Amino acid sequence: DMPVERILEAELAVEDPVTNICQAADKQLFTLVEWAKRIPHFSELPLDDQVILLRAGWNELLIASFSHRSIAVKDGILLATGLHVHRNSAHSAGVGAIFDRVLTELVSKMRDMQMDKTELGCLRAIVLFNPDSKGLSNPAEVEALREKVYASLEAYCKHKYPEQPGRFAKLLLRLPALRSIGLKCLEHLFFFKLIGDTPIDTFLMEMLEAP
């Protein structure tokens, strides 16, 4: 069983500019672990698989969260630290292109369709249960959990938004953009680490370790 109520509960339970953005990511990594612990059946996976799933998914998971948080704001993102980063600020720091991808492909789209917190929660839980993550002891169990999430998300969408039969697919079809943006963000992060001019705290640094 995979109740959307429990997924939304997990969401509500956890509620230069580049330096500020990196501090925010580190902060949210601690909170992400608590979020995942509240997603049904995650804690029952082998500890090594929980580690694999979180190491695989943390960036997409956290990007989805700050993007949805930012729907109330125009041309900016809202960090968990209470700081706002304006598009102009991101551009002036040399990271404008990737910032605009976040605004256009994620925030604006989430805004336009009025994606709700249950829907966000379920998309994130799908990202979490990524059965393609390398090294999983039982990929089939993770696949089964993902299937349970999207079965529950679709049922929710049909009941809450019956006037929008394409809504469930539209939610799922933000995932390629999320994947691409997560990968580009990670590339920047590795560069920041390489040049060494940007402080990176311990948990974010740990996530940048090789496996």
């Binding site: 672990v33 612990k37 500890l47 580690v51 979180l54 190491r55 948990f203 740990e206 370790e209």
Partner: peptide, 10 residues
């Protein structure tokens, strides 16, 4: 991955 393991334990 020491921080992650610690946090997952409890």
């Amino acid at each position: 991955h020491k921080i992650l393991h610690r946090l997952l334990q409890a």
